[PDB]
Design a protein around this ligand. Structure first.
Ligand SMILES: [Ca+2]
Length: 771
């Protein structure tokens, strides 16, 4: 490996061998189907709301999230980088697709597949990833840096449906070597959203944009139809000329054939035919190819940038609504702008690289933080783009001031912005894209007094319940299968209108978002204040026994939606105390004296009773009335965690909080698989995992990272990082279960998972205490 020194890969990048097999991998162990796309994943490409494309460590473009809200795992084999090399004065060169695998059927059988093992590495530090190619039959070593411009406090480039692939080639040998790099792409119009004749009308064109000291050559893969539909638009691939390289291309090869129409050209001398052909296809799949060829002398390095863009302006959801995607604000809505997007990337990618470096540097340059922690912190952010992210710029046919946003809970439970989960999962939004975060919370504010009296069947018991109750915060903002932002509470396993955490978590989220953006946005507090008061006032009515605390009802009426709580619970009770303290403070800021006094009185009464009911001398009991009420819950003091973040001070005595956290570390962490897997949710006082419900026996990755945040705030630094380390180990390490770029909600002690690609573990950003 002589190429790694020519490029700048951080030591904290997650690393795996190209073609590596992973032996230990976890799977769901479940009654009903659950997504399991394997451990062959990688960092995604694409901006927020753009649709994303998962290119795996094996090189394949395989995890398609281009249909917003859907996860489709299938390798489009035509989409590749390939290399040709010939040592000067040899009869023949060699050609190789840079993919560690081969097609299932006979399509593209002419191409040289099966890139060998032990011949390169994949590296990831989101939003960047890299591949190196260090192959005994390729004298010139290659690397590529690939990324999209995901940039905190930037709402423009961060939206773009674009990726850059910056190649470096180096010749460590003492012979001249002729080298070509070729990007192939299938014209994927019709891959989704088209009900009949999936390729019909697809056509490819070549654009050569020549200007002083500049040439871009690109293929634009579109359809002859000018229909404005979800399925229609364009893909583009292209390259920018640099000194010492020539460009060649082929506008049209057949992807539903043996591929030799292209490969016989590339494998001869790495130079394509430069044949334009705009003839539309009917049944056959088609694709385009862009290549560069160059001669490298001994010791010579060259850098060349390629790019990929996708202008698919319209997203359609299952309930029929069609919306424009955010990036259309910058490029237009007509779906004929892929070249413009690609050109912007090829002419600005160096600036984008620096902008990314600028926001990663503060963390990377902090040598007090271990690299493993940095690996997790950056790579967990994959989910902000990969989570079915929807970011609208108008209804098709509809203009407002704001752009509604939603991130999915996950793909198995296809719910936008699940509030009980975003309480944990939304840290990167508030910390890095706060204008999005505030927009989402205003969306929830707007729903508070919505009433929908139509009834739905509750999954857990089969009872009928009212869809949406006035004054209760919704569970979610809908599903991609139905009508995001329009039809809320898509979730039906339980009835969220009687949840005891949603209203308090909502208030806490509001005040968090004010505090973590500088305590200056009084307008945001003013917008949400009536909803905050309504939320707490409704929840107060659920106090059945006049102790001043809402009562859990012997059912799962909160985020642990199969784990019953009854009476006063540590979880909902602490959240309530913290929410009251937040509302007092908002009252003070807005000069609403009567609210301050009311919520101060509620707080003092509830705080006194919480402590009396639950403090047992060592920790806070799970609740007052359940069968295993003295279980040690990992999340027992979630309210105090948020109070620490919100600078609301002590809701419970310092000594008791410290004792509780130490108990959780000693038991839920250290007595669960030797502390190597996170914090199990429920442990009995005798040191055995609570078996009352499956959720008690699970580690929740997002709960664990939040708990590590809590410990860090409380000066339990070693316990904090040791607690978080087990989640990192399980996700990313060779000794773990292979969950990189699909971090799940949960695992059990055997490592098997629930709900891969989950929002909650974005809570790791709550560990950025100093930030
Ligand atoms: Ca009560």
């Amino acid at each position: 490996d002589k190429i790694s020194h020519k490029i700048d890969i951080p030591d904290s990048a997650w690393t795996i061998g190209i073609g590596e097999k992973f032996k230990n991998a976890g799977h769901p162990n479940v009654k009903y189907p659950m997504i399991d796309d394997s451990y062959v994943q990688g960092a995604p490409l694409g901006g927020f709301g753009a649709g994303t494309i998962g290119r795996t460590y094996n090189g394949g473009f395989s995890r398609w999230h281009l249909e917003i809200g859907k996860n489709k795992y299938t390798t489009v084999y035509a989409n590749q980088f390939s290399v040709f090399q010939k040592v000067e004065g040899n009869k023949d060169g060699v050609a190789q697709v840079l993919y560690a695998g081969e097609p299932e059927n006979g399509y593209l059988s002419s191409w040289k597949w099966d890139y060998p093992k032990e011949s390169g590495m994949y590296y990831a530090l989101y939003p960047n990833s890299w591949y190196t190619y260090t192959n005994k039959d390729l004298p010139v070593q290659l690397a590529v840096k690939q990324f999209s411009p995901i940039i905190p406090y930037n709402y423009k480039e961060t939206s773009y449906p674009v990726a850059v692939f910056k190649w470096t080639a180096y010749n460590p040998t003492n012979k001249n070597v002729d080298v070509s790099i070729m990007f192939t792409w299938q014209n994927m119009i019709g891959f989704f959203g088209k009900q009949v004749n999936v390729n019909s009308g697809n056509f490819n064109k070549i654009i050569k944009d020549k200007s002083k000291d500049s040439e871009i050559v690109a293929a634009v893969m579109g359809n002859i139809s000018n229909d404005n539909e979800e399925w229609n638009g364009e893909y583009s691939i292209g390259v920018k000329k640099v000194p010492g390289v020539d460009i060649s291309y082929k506008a049209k090869f057949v992807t539903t054939g043996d591929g030799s129409d292209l490969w016989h050209e590339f494998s001869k001398n790495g130079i394509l035919d430069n044949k334009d052909d705009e003839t539309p296809t009917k049944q056959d799949g088609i694709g385009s190819a862009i290549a560069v060829n160059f001669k490298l002398q001994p010791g010579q390095t060259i850098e060349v940038p390629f790019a990929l863009s996708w202008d698919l302006p319209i997203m359609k959801f299952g309930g029929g609504d069609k919306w424009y995607k955010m990036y259309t604000k910058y490029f237009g809505k007509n779906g004929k702008n892929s070249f413009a997007i690609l050109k912007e990337a090829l002419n600005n990618y160096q600036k984008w690289e620096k902008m990314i470096d600028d926001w990663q540097k503060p963390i990377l340059s902090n040598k007090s933080k271990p690299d493993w922690y940095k690996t997790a912190l950056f790579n967990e952010l994959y989910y902000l783009a990969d989570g079915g992210t929807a970011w609208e710029n108008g209804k098709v046919g509809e203009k407002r001031t704001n752009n509604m946003f939603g991130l999915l809970e996950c793909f198995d439970y296809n719910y936008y912005e699940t509030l009980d989960v975003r309480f944990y999962g939304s840290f990167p939004l508030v910390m890095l894209w706060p204008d999005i975060e505030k927009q989402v919370m205003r969306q929830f504010a707007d729903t508070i007094n919505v009433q929908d009296s139509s009834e739905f069947k509750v999954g857990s018991n089969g009872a009928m319940a009212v869809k949406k109750v006035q004054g209760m915060i919704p569970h979610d903002l809908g599903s991609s299968y139905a009508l995001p932002w329009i039809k809320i509470n898509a979730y039906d396993w339980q009835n969220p209108n009687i949840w005891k955490d949603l209203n308090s978590k909502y208030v806490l989220l509001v005040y968090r978002d004010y505090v973590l953006t500088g305590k200056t946005d009084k307008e945001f507090l003013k917008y949400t204040w009536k909803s905050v008061k309504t939320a707490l006032d409704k929840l107060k009515e659920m106090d059945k026994d006049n102790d001043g605390i809402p009562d859990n009802e012997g059912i799962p009426d909160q985020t642990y939606d199969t784990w019953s709580m009854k009476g006063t619970s540590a979880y909902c009770g602490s959240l309530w105390l913290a929410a009251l303290k937040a509302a007092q403070e908002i009252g003070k800021v807005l000069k609403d004296n009567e609210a301050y006094i009311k919520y101060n009185e509620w707080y003092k009464i509830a705080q006194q009773n919480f402590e009396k009911e639950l403090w047992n001398g060592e920790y806070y009991n799970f609740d007052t009335e359940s069968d295993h009420k003295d279980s040690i819950m990992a999340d027992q003091l979630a309210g105090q965690w948020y109070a620490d973040i919100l600078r609301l001070g002590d809701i419970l005595p310092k000594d008791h909080v410290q004792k509780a956290l130490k108990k959780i570390y000693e038991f839920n962490v250290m007595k669960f698989e030797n502390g190597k897997m996170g914090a199990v949710n429920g442990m009995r006082p005798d040191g055995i995992v609570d078996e009352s419900d499956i959720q008690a026996q699970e580690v929740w990755t997002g709960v664990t990272y939040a708990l590590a945040s809590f410990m860090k705030y409380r000066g339990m630094t070693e316990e904090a990082y040791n607690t978080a380390y087990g989640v990192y180990k399980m996700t990313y390490d060779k000794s773990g279960k292979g969950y990189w770029f699909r971090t799940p909600e949960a695992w059990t002690k055997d490592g098997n998972y629930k709900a891969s690609m989950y929002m909650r573990p974005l809570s790791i950003w709550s560990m950025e205490v100093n930030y």
